[PDB]
């Protein structure tokens, strides 16, 4: 199982054509302020295949 | 009720707010598969089964 290949799952908005985003931050899935603590409503967008 | 005698309920013809349950942390697991849990209050269907 090769896990070097990964991609972003969550984002606040879409991507404009022909650009790159390398922001690896906690994503707030709800009203809970993550503040870099993860937990409920706070997920890691990057994940592998 | 029991797991093999689970209660079945029908919900129709009213206004349903999901924000109150969405924000509540008293539930250990809240897993939505049909659609995004955030946009529940926007789209709606003809009936709900619980």
Q: Are strands A46-48 and A6-8 parallel, antiparallel or unpaired?
A: antiparallel
Element of type H or E holding B49: strand B48-49
Q: What b/e sequence results for A30-40 when a residue is b if at least 16 CB atoms lie within 10 Å of its CB, and e otherwise?
A: eeeebeeeeee
Contacts of B25 in chain A (CB under 8 A): 32, 40
Q: Which residues pair with residue B48 across a beta bridge?
A: B11
Decide: B22 and B37 in contact? Cβ < 8 Å.
yes
Residues 6+ apart with CB under 8 A from A7: A46, A47, A49
Contacts of A30 in chain B (CB under 8 A): 22-23, 38
Report the residue of chain B nearest A29, measured CA to CA. Answer: B38
**Angstrom distance (rounded) from CA A47 to CA A27:** 13
């Amino acid at each position: 199982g090769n896990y070097n290949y990964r991609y972003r799952l969550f984002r606040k908005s879409n991507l404009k054509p022909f650009e790159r985003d390398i922001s690896t931050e906690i994503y707030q899935a709800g009203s809970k302020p993550c503040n870099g603590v993860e937990g409920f409503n706070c997920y890691f967008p990057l994940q592998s295949y | 009720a029991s797991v093999y005698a689970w209660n079945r309920k029908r919900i129709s013809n009213c206004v349903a707010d999901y924000s109150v349950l969405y924000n509540s942390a008293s539930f250990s697991t809240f897993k939505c598969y049909g659609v995004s849990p955030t946009k529940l209050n926007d789209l709606c269907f003809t009936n709900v089964y619980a």
